[PDB]
Amino acid sequence: KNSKIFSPFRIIGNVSNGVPFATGTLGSTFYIVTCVGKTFQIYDANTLHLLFVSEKETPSSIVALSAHFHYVYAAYENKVGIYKRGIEEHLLELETDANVEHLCIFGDYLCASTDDNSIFIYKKSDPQDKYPSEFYTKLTVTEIQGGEIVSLQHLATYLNKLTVVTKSNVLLFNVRTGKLVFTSNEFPDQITTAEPAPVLDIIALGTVTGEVIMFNMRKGKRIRTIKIPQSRISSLSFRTDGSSHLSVGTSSGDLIFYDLDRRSRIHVLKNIHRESYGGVTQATFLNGQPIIVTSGGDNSLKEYVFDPSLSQGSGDVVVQPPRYLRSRGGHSQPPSYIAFADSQSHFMLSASKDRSLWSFSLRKDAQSQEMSQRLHKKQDGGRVGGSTIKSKFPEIVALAIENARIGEWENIITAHKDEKFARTWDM
Amino acid sequence: SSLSDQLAQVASNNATVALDRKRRQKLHSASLIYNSKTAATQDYDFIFENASKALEELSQIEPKFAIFSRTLFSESSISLDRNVQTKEEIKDLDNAINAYLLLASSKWYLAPTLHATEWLVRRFQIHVKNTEMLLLSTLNYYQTPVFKRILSIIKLPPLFNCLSNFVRSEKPPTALTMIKLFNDMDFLKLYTSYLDQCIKHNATYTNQLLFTTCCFINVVAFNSNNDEKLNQLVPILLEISAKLLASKSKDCQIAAHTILVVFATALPLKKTIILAAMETILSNLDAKEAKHSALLTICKLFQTLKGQGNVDQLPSKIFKLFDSKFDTVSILTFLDKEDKPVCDKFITSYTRSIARYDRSKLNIILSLLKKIRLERYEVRLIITDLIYLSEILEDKSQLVELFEYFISINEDLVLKCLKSLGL
Amino acid sequence: PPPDEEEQLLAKFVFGDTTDLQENLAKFNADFEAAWIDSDDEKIKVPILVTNKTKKLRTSYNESKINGVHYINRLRSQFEKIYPRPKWVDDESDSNGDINALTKILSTTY
Amino acid sequence: KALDLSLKEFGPYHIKYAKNGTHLLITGRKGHVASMDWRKGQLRAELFLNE
Amino acid sequence: EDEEDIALEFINGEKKDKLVNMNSFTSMFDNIQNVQMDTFFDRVMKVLT
């Protein structure tokens, strides 16, 4: 179905489609690889400029994403792609009929997980080789060990050990042996998220109910337990900057910053992502930085920061609340109508079904500005017949724009759905 | 960062080091008692002699200062310097100075304490190195020339910007600006940590506690509109109340009662939170005046809360704790008091709890009902649970006597309840 | 010959000795096993001098290989050098009416 | 006293102390010239020169 | 009698109280010196009830 005139290039105005992103670094440059359906992008995190984008589409949507140093590991319908700067360079077809559900990488061992509880371990062809290509082995977890595979992690300082967190317990698999070396005890609550703490041998498990279990593998024991009820825990992160703060992102779209030393709730952020689209699908501290990147499923990606404390002596007791820092976003729904703002092809207006007009840049995606809806005061200065609370206009069914006199009066006219008047907009 | 900001940082790091005669005359002229000229012209041995006399006076007052005579008030304490010492010794100095300010927070009307603190200021530079502990210490004396002098000579950390307005004027700081200081949120966390240190060292007093509670009540009154601000101000004040109840002194318990009462009548809390507050109060209740104010507090809290499950019965543990720490004759004479505060929902829940659990003191129940003027839905609830208790328990003469009392007062309600449930 | 006590006092006074104050300050205080092992993880031996990070991990110039348990102990010590071990995970673990039920409800509700 | 200033905008900086040992003077490669007392943390003179 | 009768009974049974405006406790700073904690609590409950 390929053409002789056109060719797909990229996608404007998308930051995430709900699949949890992955952070990584190249020395000073911190990057964030985020999926958009069949095509991922790689953002910077120092300034959130776009850095790379996958030039070739995947035939289906990407299911899993990971990224160590200079390689991005995508997992769509059956295969794993090892890509470099968005250029696909190694495909890896699994020898099954299932779909790849989880993925991790450590040392010379890629570890994928297909939904019928089937783990695949891949070895690099050389210790100095860059990506695992050779198929090492395949393991399976039947139902006597645990439930469905929820997550794969690799704890630090574990020679060829892989931590498999299922819905019921926590297993340790040695891939050099291909053997389950240690199964943990049973938890009455189904586990949803896992996170390797920067402390040794300890993983945090967020369950379906409000339980954050700090569990140690060496003792095989629940060291600590934090109770948040009426909440499904959806993301966990640890401040590695030099303080003991935990970030719990619950699927009602909330963030809670806990202090583990004083056993306190430092702060809570309400509705940083839309609850209807899953809420906070990932919250992640930057490694060694007081900056948390929070992505939702509503095509929104924010970055918050922690200021230094104002108290000279106390500090960690008098900790500052999280300041909002930079962000990108898009539409919740698909856009309804689009137009080009000028002959230079720099900006594009797009109105969607979510009752919102947005002007996107084209060059580098740093300028995805929502167009405000803040009414101008009338020249008469009289009263307007309207309610007490603001609410966005209905969806835009037609649009027209000119640039012959921009910045001297209005130059966009938008016709809304089921509305007996069209609005003007200043560009 | 901008180079001006980085040089400001290095100035704040080398703040207390005198690198010329002018900066030395500044750091030495800043004094607590003497003015600028004589403060500049006098000397360390003069100051230390006055310090030793003032502190032996203070040890005569109370024997706690002898350790500071041993370690902070010696001739080697003349000889040393802050900056030439290492980081560990700096931290140890700050710990000793915080202990001393915590101790001398309570005698600020005494010229001996003023003289000892003058020595500490002009030798160890507390008014430059650690101003937060000193200001949290002497905040409650905000209408005193000592506090005005501290405000004139101090360098202000960024939280005390209202006092930064009030520097070098001639009027004391106002109650309104004290309210603004405590109305800032992070300053409340600062003062929370300070009160926690004060509690864990068990050195609190009536004037400090009174100023604390008056500021807190005025703060929640100033925030009596913003429900988001009230909700995010719940954990601070309620945690201060929790640890102030964990303390043992009757002053701390009455201050916690006051904060709890005003908070629960300014913002409608949850039933579980009010039951938890009642549980901690009943657990740590010890003394007579604390008992009196605590009974008034439970009255106020149950009079505030209102919802589905308003007058339901107390749980087993809370009810047993209440009848342990309180007697029927005491609650009876409290009802017999002349003021008669509105114990409607509280007496209703207490009566239903007694009727479920004990089923013995029904004459005491009758005395409560005859003493208090009840309310219609509460009497309806009482009659329904009494119907259930009559049908479960064996029939009692005092039980049918309570029924006859209802015949005296509104038999028709008993008829409506019995026709909804029974004959 | 050791010094006398009174001449030690005189020496302190003359030289301006402050270590007695220093000890008073530093002594001042407010008076008022595992679950699993692995045989191949024990008996595994890895090379050492083949890369710079493990040449950093080692301790002896002439050693070239070490077994798995010592290798992983050196690795854990390096990981500790990276991330300092915190008190919340070191010194704390969970395992008539009370006084902190109010605090527990304050913890459990927003 | 042992400082570490980072001004990454302009070129490799040149350091000269006074003969007393109190004032420092840095000159960047593009236009930054700063003379600072540097102990009491006071900026005596800052000059931006594109030359 | 129905649930509407019970609900109206509860509404009629509820009574009013003195609310907490922002300018009520501003006299305790003036009458806080040299007092007792008990008497301060009595003044608080007086200005509340």
Add this chain to the structure above:
Amino acid sequence: PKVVREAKKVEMTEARAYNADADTAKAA
């Protein structure tokens, strides 16, 4: 004057890290 809560620029400094390729090692 109320308390100033000024914002400032954030600088993402260098981040040391742990090596999973040092964790996974070959057998003897």
Add this chain to the structure above:
Amino acid sequence: ESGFVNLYDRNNAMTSSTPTPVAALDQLTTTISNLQFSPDGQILCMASRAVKDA
């Protein structure tokens, strides 16, 4: 018509026989033209015909 509204409780007016108002509301500055309660007795609307938004 002085904008004032005196609010009484029946259970005590009927026995006091020269009662005191439970409240004396004054938030309007022109004559009162509509006093109406809620259908359950919780809200009292007072509307003045003289000035707009009253």
